[PDB]
Amino acid sequence: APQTITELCSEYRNTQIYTINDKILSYTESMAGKREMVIITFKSGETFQVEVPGSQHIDSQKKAIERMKDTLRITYLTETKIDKLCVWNNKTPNSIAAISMKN
Amino acid sequence: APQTITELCSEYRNTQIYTINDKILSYTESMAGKREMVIITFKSGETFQVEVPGSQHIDSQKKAIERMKDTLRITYLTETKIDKLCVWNNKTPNSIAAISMKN
Amino acid sequence: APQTITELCSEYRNTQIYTINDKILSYTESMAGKREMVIITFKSGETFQVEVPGSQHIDSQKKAIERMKDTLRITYLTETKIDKLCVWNNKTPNSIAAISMKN
Amino acid sequence: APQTITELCSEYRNTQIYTINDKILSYTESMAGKREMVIITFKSGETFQVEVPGSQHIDSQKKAIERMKDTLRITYLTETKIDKLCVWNNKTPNSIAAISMKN
Amino acid sequence: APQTITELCSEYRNTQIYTINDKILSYTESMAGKREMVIITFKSGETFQVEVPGSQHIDSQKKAIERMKDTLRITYLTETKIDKLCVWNNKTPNSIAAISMKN
Amino acid sequence: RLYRADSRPPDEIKRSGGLMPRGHNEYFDRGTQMNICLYDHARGTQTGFVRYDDGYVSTSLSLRSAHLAGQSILSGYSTYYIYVIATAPNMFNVNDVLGVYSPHPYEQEVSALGGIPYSQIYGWYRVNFGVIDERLHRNREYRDRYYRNLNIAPAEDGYRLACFPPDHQAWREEPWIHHAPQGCGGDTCNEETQNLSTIYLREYQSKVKRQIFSDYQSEVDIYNRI
Ligand SMILES: OC[C@H]1O[C@@H](O[C@H]2[C@H](O)[C@@H](O)[C@H](O)O[C@@H]2CO)[C@H](O)[C@@H](O)[C@H]1O
Numbered sequence: 027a028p029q030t031i032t033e034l035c036s037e038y039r040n041t042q043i044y045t046i047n048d049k050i051l052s053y054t055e056s057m058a059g060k061r062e063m064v065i066i067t068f069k070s071g072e073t074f075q076v077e078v079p080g081s082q083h084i085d086s087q088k089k090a091i092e093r094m095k096d097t098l099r100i101t102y103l104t105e106t107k108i109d110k111l112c113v114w115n116n117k118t119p120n121s122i123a124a125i126s127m128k129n
Numbered sequence: 130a131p132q133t134i135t136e137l138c139s140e141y142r143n144t145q146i147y148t149i150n151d152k153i154l155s156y157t158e159s160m161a162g163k164r165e166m167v168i169i170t171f172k173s174g175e176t177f178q179v180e181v182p183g184s185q186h187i188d189s190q191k192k193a194i195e196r197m198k199d200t201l202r203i204t205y206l207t208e209t210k211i212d213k214l215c216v217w218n219n220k221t222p223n224s225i226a227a228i229s230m231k232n
Numbered sequence: 233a234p235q236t237i238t239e240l241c242s243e244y245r246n247t248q249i250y251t252i253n254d255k256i257l258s259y260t261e262s263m264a265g266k267r268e269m270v271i272i273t274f275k276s277g278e279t280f281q282v283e284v285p286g287s288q289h290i291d292s293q294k295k296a297i298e299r300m301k302d303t304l305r306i307t308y309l310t311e312t313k314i315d316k317l318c319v320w321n322n323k324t325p326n327s328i329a330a331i332s333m334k335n
Numbered sequence: 336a337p338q339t340i341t342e343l344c345s346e347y348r349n350t351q352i353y354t355i356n357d358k359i360l361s362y363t364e365s366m367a368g369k370r371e372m373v374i375i376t377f378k379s380g381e382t383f384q385v386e387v388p389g390s391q392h393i394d395s396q397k398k399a400i401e402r403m404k405d406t407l408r409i410t411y412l413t414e415t416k417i418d419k420l421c422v423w424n425n426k427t428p429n430s431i432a433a434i435s436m437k438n
Numbered sequence: 439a440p441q442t443i444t445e446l447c448s449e450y451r452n453t454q455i456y457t458i459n460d461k462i463l464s465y466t467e468s469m470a471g472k473r474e475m476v477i478i479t480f481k482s483g484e485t486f487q488v489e490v491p492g493s494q495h496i497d498s499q500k501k502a503i504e505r506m507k508d509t510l511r512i513t514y515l516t517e518t519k520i521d522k523l524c525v526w527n528n529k530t531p532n533s534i535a536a537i538s539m540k541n
Numbered sequence: 542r543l544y545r546a547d548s549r550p551p552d553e554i555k556r557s558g559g560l561m562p563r564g565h566n567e568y569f570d571r572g573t574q575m576n577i578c579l580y581d582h583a584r585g586t587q588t589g590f591v592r593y594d595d596g597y598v599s600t601s602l603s604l605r606s607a608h609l610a611g612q613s614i615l616s617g618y619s620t621y622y623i624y625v626i627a628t629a630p631n632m633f634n635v636n637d638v639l640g641v642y643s644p645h646p647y648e649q650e651v652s653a654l655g656g657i658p659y660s661q662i663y664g665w666y667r668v669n670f671g672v673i674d675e676r677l678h679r680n681r682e683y684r685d686r687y688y689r690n691l692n693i694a695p696a697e698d699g700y701r702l703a704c705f706p707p708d709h710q711a712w713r714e715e716p717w718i719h720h721a722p723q724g725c726g727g728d729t730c731n732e733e734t735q736n737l738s739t740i741y742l743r744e745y746q747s748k749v750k751r752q753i754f755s756d757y758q759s760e761v762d763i764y765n766r767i
Pocket residue numbers: 039040077082083084087114116117121471
């Protein structure tokens with residue numbers, strides 16, 4: 027299996043790596059019908075989302091989507107610095123595929 | 130997809146944005162029959178609820194409702210400032226659809 | 233629709249509001265067969281339980297019972313003050329129906 | 336229902352109360368097949384396990400077991416003192432049935 | 439049942455103990471299809487993964503893979519030192535079977 | 542409880558995550574590498590501040606002593622505060638570690654290695670025109686259960702963090718001799734002393750994150766998720 031986020035990111039089409047190296051400025055959580063998602067922004071202007079679960083997701087990704095939202099909430103609350111984000115750039119805002127943090 | 134809470138709020142009918150910029154004053158949780166919900170209050174006197182899951186909710190919303198309640202409990206216990214709330218104003222108390230926090 | 237715990241409490245029979253205004257003194261959790269419950273006590277001598285799920289509990293309450301147990305554990309750990317409790321007095325110890333906290 | 340860990344413990348066979356009054360020294364978590372379990376030890380030398388779900392467990396205990404593991408992890412991380420433990424002493428290491436903490 | 443991670447580790451084929459005694463350097467989480475996993479690394483240069491759930495995992499391990507990822511995330515955030523890891527060395531990166539922490 | 546007069550107000554202290562040493566913005570900021578050195582900290586004096594350079598924030602053993610120091614240093618300040626701090630292992634009694642080589646003996650300072658986390662501050666009193674407002678304001682984020690039972694770090698653990706210079710006779714004598722870092726009594730000594738002090742701090746900071754970050758840990762229903 028991949029050993030880094032860059033390596034893992036490279037095996038998908040439409041992805042790209044953002045070196046954030048910064049904490050989350052804002053966190054938005056929604057339970058509104060058909061818009062059950064999380065949105066995060068950074069002080070640089072970047073905005074990224076965890077997509078509403080849809081057909082573009084295989085079954086195994088469902089529990090992973092839930093895990094990612096748990097991670098972003100606690101990362102925001104603890105003001106933990108995010109190192110890199112692997113995102114699908116064919117979605118606006120760019121969709122989070124993976125995240126990495128280093129101490 | 131929406132990029133901010135306001136944009137997401139505007140996609141629904143019977144919603145409104147409340148600018149809070151303050152920590153939650155009181156938190157109420159109930160496991161009583163037919164009223165399994167959460168109610169939060171602010172210094173301003175404003176009161177909001179996370180509705181009891183029902184027919185008005187599509188199956189995708191069910192998991193997001195539980196998440197919202199987890200988020201509110203955490204926010205209350207840590208006195209974390211809430212930035213804005215997107216609520217359905219056709220319920221009493223107003224129903225929470227999305228929340229945003231900043232900094 | 234209820235706006236406060238007291239208003240919510242009045243909708244059920246055999247309930248009573250206890251004004252605690254104090255942190256939990258002790259927390260007990262059991263996974264023993266037929267005794268899966270949580271018991272909390274206060275300095276004043278008051279003892280309450282979150283009941284073993286049973287026939288008196290409906291589907292919608294199953295999840296709510298697990299949330300209350302989660303709430304009592306974290307509340308204990310953070311030494312957060314509990315303002316009021318709405319409990320069913322036809323059980324010993326009295327059974328928690330709803331909880332509220334403030335500040 | 337029982338009102339204390341001692342009373343609750345007494346309702347089962349092969350149980351025993353241990354008064355710990357100390358924080359957990361080490362925490363061991365395993366995901367290995369047939370050994371999905373948690374083992375904790377104290378400075379005094381006692382070692383206890385939350386046991387792997389099995390035939391000796393009723394359905395209501397499946398969730399209770401997961402909760403106990405959540406509890407042991409968070410109490411370990413926060414260095415919170417465990418007051419007493421009710422354990423089944425017919426297992427090696429002794430199996431945890433209930434736990435109490437007081438401050 | 440085992441009493442230590444070493445004892446638990448030796449019950450499986452293709453495993454080995456790694457004495458880390460160090461906090462996690464980096465944490466990587468992916469929700470990408472077929473790569474739903476976590477990857478951790480240490481200052482020493484060692485890299486480990488919690489594998490993607492597959493056919494090498496019996497049913498009971500499913501809930502344990504999830505718990506493990508929750509533990510690694512909170513252990514990383516708090517900078518808590520990992521003592522030993524029991525890993526399957528027939529995978530690249532080595533796959534985590536059990537973890538232990540002390541103090 | 543330990544006490545410290547400081548011009549920096551409660552909300553600033555909250556923004557920083559505690560009472561920081563000179564040049565440290567936030568408590569958990571490993572971004573700027575601080576020079577942690579007890580002996581050097583014990584000798585320097587600051588303008589408008591009670592001793593807080595060289596990675597250590599100074600504190601008095603009483604409100605009065607804390608008041609006296611404030612009056613002398615913060616003599617012309619309409620308002621300043623005196624923070625009430627719980628005892629814990631990040632605190633070192635300066636006289637006990639530096640012994641007979643303690644630069645400012647009589648004062649009796651107890652210094653916190655790396656600063657003082659917000660959650661360790663019990664409260665504070667406001668001081669108006671040099672006069673103390675006897676109303677103790679309580680800090681809501683003070684971890685009572687955690688700090689309740691902690692004490693200052695015993696002198697034995699501080700000797701190797703003493704930071705006396707390499708050729709300073711103290712390293713060539715009891716009891717510092719048994720605790721001298723690798724190279725004390727070349728630059729190895731300095732980098733070794735700085736490495737040990739930073740290790741001690743990083744470990745204490747982890748104890749703190751274990752307290753404050755656990756409040757955010759939310760448990761999952763694995764059976765519903767899986
Ligand atoms: O899985 C989330 C991710 O899906 C991408 O869609 C993939 C899809 O997962 C794959 O199974 C199919 O072959 O089509 C796409 C190939 O790129 C989306 O493109 C991406 O935006 C995310 O939504």
